[PDB]
Amino acid sequence: GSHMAMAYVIRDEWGNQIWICPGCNKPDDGSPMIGCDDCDDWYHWPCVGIMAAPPEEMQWFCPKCANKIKKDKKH
Ligand SMILES: [Zn+2]
Ligand SMILES: [Zn+2]
């Protein structure tokens, strides 16, 4: 069973998922959020360095999944 990943998850007033971006360790405190192409969860703009909304054709990966890209990407 998952012992971890129980946190970084808060419920909103309406019951929405408050994502705690594992990049900064902040929840949505009122920022624009961006989701990964490999993972399901959402990160924030300042954490990853988003200047403006990136293309959808582009596959965007957080510092976590960028590390999966690693160096040697085969995609
Ligand atoms: Zn963040
Ligand atoms: Zn990711």
Curated annotation (Swiss-Prot):
Span of zinc fingers (PHD-type): 18-68
Compartments it resides in: Nucleus
Family listed: Belongs to the TAF3 family.
Assembly information from the UniProt record: Component of the TFIID basal transcription factor complex, composed of TATA-box-binding protein TBP, and a number of TBP-associated factors (TAFs), including TAF1, TAF2, TAF3, TAF4, TAF5, TAF6, TAF7, TAF8, TAF9, TAF10, TAF11, TAF12 and TAF13. Interacts with TAF10 via histone fold. Interacts with TAF13, TBP, SAP130 and GCN5L2. Interacts with TBPL2.
Role played: The TFIID basal transcription factor complex plays a major role in the initiation of RNA polymerase II (Pol II)-dependent transcription. TFIID recognizes and binds promoters with or without a TATA box via its subunit TBP, a TATA-box-binding protein, and promotes assembly of the pre-initiation complex (PIC). The TFIID complex consists of TBP and TBP-associated factors (TAFs), including TAF1, TAF2, TAF3, TAF4, TAF5, TAF6, TAF7, TAF8, TAF9, TAF10, TAF11, TAF12 and TAF13. The TFIID complex structure can be divided into 3 modules TFIID-A, TFIID-B, and TFIID-C.
Domain statement: The PHD-type zinc finger mediates binding to histone H3 methyllysine at position 4 (H3K4me3).
Protein name as it appears in the record: Transcription initiation factor TFIID subunit 3
Gene field: Taf3
